[PDB]
Design an enzyme around this catalytic site. Structure first.
Site, PDB file in Angstrom:
ATOM      1  N   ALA A 488       0.722  -0.958  -0.150  1.00  0.00           N
ATOM      2  CA  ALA A 488       0.042   0.188   0.117  1.00  0.00           C
ATOM      3  C   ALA A 488       0.767   1.323  -0.094  1.00  0.00           C
ATOM      4  O   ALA A 488       2.041   1.066   0.564  1.00  0.00           O
ATOM      5  CB  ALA A 488      -0.751   0.121   1.348  1.00  0.00           C
ATOM      6  N   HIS A 647      15.260  -4.130 -13.213  1.00  0.00           N
ATOM      7  CA  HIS A 647      14.266  -4.981 -12.370  1.00  0.00           C
ATOM      8  C   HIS A 647      14.369  -6.457 -12.273  1.00  0.00           C
ATOM      9  O   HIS A 647      13.367  -7.129 -12.117  1.00  0.00           O
ATOM     10  CB  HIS A 647      12.934  -4.661 -13.276  1.00  0.00           C
ATOM     11  CG  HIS A 647      12.485  -3.158 -13.366  1.00  0.00           C
ATOM     12  ND1 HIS A 647      12.512  -2.594 -14.402  1.00  0.00           N
ATOM     13  CD2 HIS A 647      11.824  -2.459 -12.371  1.00  0.00           C
ATOM     14  CE1 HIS A 647      12.249  -1.403 -14.028  1.00  0.00           C
ATOM     15  NE2 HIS A 647      11.830  -1.140 -12.768  1.00  0.00           N
TER      16      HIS A 647
END
Length: 706
Positions: A488, A647
């Site tokens: 979140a 990544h």
């Protein structure tokens, strides 16, 4: 008698109890019994909040233990092939979402233009079938708390297949799912369901134009198969595409977004195309945190009511996209907090909008307007900023002329090497950061990178770091919003006029530069990313906001330049989320970003090199805008070359990186390129990172030789 509803609600819980629960389960510290029990406890609390707010139709079905699209994949048996042999239960659910010892997880993608990410369905040769009674169970559970107010919600088949991967025939896939939805709906009606919300947001997008006929076929099918259900063809995030065509779908109600699709949907309404249908009007911003402009909103509702058979009031989109409540935000100024509205406050707003429309007398209505008015009259929204007519919007010398001047001062070699900015990661803390900054300066010098960076070790978020020191911004204590899975974010809030009052990045940048003879880049974040990641004000237009931010960046750049920083970079990572959904509105957005970029970077000396990094994929549609920026260099006409996928923990080889760098040199003059890794490096590991940067330098030094 104007009904009040909502499309969905956050799963987090007031204190992110949901996050702690599922993460604890994954860590083996919470049993299945407690996972389900804790999840049920949360669901019942959410239902009660919506019941107590006065909702007539409370959404049920969007709660999830990870993602609502993944819920459908497991429920409909669209399970990735590699997982086919696993018992279908909660552990498979999480395995698909997070992966396991033998199989990688399904990929995730942005949910339309929001900051939420869904889990992408992987179609193969599997035949769809219902593997559980997910929605029926949730519905029956909800009925015990809210009775006939319970409104089942589910993502429609067209949108579901459109958001999937591995589908060679769109219509075939959609059709294979219809019998499942049919049973799902039939069972819900048998259990007592009336109104059923079917989300088909694909119909607010350009792509949606290709599925108009599929909608007619699909909903005609549902209408005949489940006659007693009152289906709500729910859309959100933009206006309804081809409203005249879609208005004739055989559904009882249409959910239209009047916050993000105002002009378009209002036009559709004024034609009388929906005079015979019930409209679920999304009039409360489901993606931002400002209390509603009741006078404006109530006037709109009167217009909507006069043009529809019936009307239900609700937010624009699921409240999944905003934090839970302003209740415990004690550090905020009272004038500000009283003008804020998070999820729980929006449930109250819809109820009050309906009461006002119905003629019910409620003191809270005008009191709401009073607090709204106080916020607008606040001193922080009436700050005297710098007069833009006295700020340069074009540099005195063109690229060509600046190119030479900069070359004479920097004396950089062919195909200079550098990085994007971040590396892996009162007085005590500062010296701790500086020690690490130096350690990585030596590491960079030892690898022989031509242009260095300090590491951004003191930064945890490329936006919060700036918002922390800018007037007009504030942070919340508990304003969390789910981004993906159990992760979140707590977005900062741009509540007032933005103004730069103190140096933000000077100290560390100058420190880093004082430790080396090589040029050190300044690192700033642009307006696209600052506005997209933050909850921006909605009381002033986009261009005004972009320009205020542009001015603040300009002020910071002046401090850096005065301090001797020769290279300054402007970062933009959210162009993918910021660019408007509709193709027809993208040029205006780009034009605003370009102008703000000019405001921020047109007041530097010609010798000062301006870099901009933009995480993106296809510049083909936005090439003239990139040129308009007139940036000396842009890492991805000087252009930086990313040739190291940051990544992934994978370390490239010289042979691979050498190919990456040589491909682009096939056309334009090699005197315009740089070499560096892709977007960022903060999420990488030191060993892998250093070893990977070593191959980058060697590969480049080899191409120079060639």
């Amino acid at each position: 008698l104007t009904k009040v509803s909502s499309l969905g609600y956050p799963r987090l819980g007031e204190n992110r109890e949901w996050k702690k629960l599922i993460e604890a389960y994954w860590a083996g510290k919470v049993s299945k019994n407690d996972l389900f029990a804790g999840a049920k406890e949360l669901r019942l609390d959410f239902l009660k909040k919506q019941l107590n707010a006065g909702l007539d139709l409370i959404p049920v079905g969007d709660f999830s233990l990870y993602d609502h699209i993944l819920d459908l994949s497991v429920q409909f048996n669209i399970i990735p092939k590699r997982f086919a042999k696993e018992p279908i239960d909660i552990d498979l659910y999480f395995a698909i979402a997070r992966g396991n010892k033998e199989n990688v997880a399904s990929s995730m993608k942005k949910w339309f233009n929001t900051n939420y990410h869904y889990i992408v369905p992987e179609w193969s040769k599997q035949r769809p079938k219902l593997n559980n009674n997910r929605l029926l169970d949730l519905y029956l559970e909800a009925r015990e708390v809210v009775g006939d107010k319970a409104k089942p919600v589910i993502t429609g088949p067209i949108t579901y297949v459109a958001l999937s991967t591995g589908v060679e025939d769109f219509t075939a896939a959609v059709k294979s799912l219809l019998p499942l939805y049919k049973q799902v709906f039939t069972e819900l009606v048998k259990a007592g369901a009336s109104y059923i919300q079917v989300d088909e947001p694909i119909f607010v997008t350009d792509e949606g134009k290709d599925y108009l006929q599929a909608a007619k076929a699909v909903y005609a099918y549902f209408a005949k198969e489940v006659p007693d259900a009152k289906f709500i063809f729910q859309t959100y995030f933009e206006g309804l595409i081809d409203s005249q065509v879609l208005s004739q779908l055989p559904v009882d109600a249409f959910g239209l977004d009047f916050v993000y699709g105002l002009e378009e949907n209002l036009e559709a309404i004024k034609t009388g195309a929906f005079k015979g249908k019930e409209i679920f009007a999304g009039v409360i911003d489901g993606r931002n945190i400002w209390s509603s402009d009741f006078v404006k909103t109530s006037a709109l509702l009167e217009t909507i009511e006069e043009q529809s058979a019936a009307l239900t009031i609700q937010p624009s989109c699921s409240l999944l996209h905003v934090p839970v409540t302003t209740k415990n935000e004690t550090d905020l100024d009272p004038v500000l907090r009283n003008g804020l509205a998070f999820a729980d406050e929006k449930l109250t707003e819809v109820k009050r909008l309906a009461e006002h429309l119905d003629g019910r007398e409620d003191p809270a209505y005008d009191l709401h307007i009073a607090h709204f008015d106080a916020l607008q009259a606040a001193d922080f929204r009436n700050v005297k900023l710098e007069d833009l007519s006295r700020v340069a919007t074009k540099r005195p010398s063109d690229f060509a002329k600046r190119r030479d001047i900069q070359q004479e001062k920097l004396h950089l070699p062919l195909l200079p090497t550098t990085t994007i900015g971040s590396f892996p990661q009162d007085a005590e803390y500062k010296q701790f950061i500086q020690a690490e900054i130096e350690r990585w300066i030596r590491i960079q010098e030892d690898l022989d990178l031509d242009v260095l960076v300090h590491g951004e070790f003191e930064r945890v978020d490329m936006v919060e770091f700036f918002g922390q020191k800018l007037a007009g911004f504030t942070t919340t204590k508990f304003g969390w919003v789910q981004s993906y899975g159990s992760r979140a974010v707590k977005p900062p809030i741009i509540y007032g006029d933005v103004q730069h009052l103190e140096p933000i990045t000077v100290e560390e940048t100058v420190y880093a530069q004082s430790l080396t003879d090589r040029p050190v880049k300044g690192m700033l974040t642009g307006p696209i990313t600052i506005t997209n990641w933050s909850f921006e004000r909605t009381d002033i237009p986009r261009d005004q906001l972009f320009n205020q931010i542009g001015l603040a960046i300009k002020d910071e750049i002046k401090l850096l330049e005065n301090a001797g920083i020769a290279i300054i970079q402007v970062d933009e990572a959210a162009l993918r989320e910021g660019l408007p959904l509709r193709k027809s509105k993208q040029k205006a957005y780009l034009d605003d970003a370009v102008h703000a970029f000019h405001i921020a970077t047109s007041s530097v000396k010609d010798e000062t090199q301006i870099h901009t990094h933009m995480c993106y994929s296809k510049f083909d549609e936005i090439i003239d805008a990139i040129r308009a920026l007139d940036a000396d260099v842009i890492s991805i006409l000087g252009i930086g070359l990313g040739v190291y996928d940051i990544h992934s923990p994978r370390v490239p080889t010289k042979e691979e990186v050498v190919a990456n760098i040589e491909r682009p040199l096939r056309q334009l003059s090699p005197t315009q390129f740089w070499v560096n890794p892709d977007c960022g490096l903060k999420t990488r590991q030191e060993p892998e990172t250093i070893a990977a940067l070593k191959v980058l330098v060697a590969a480049t030094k080899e191409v120079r030789q060639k």
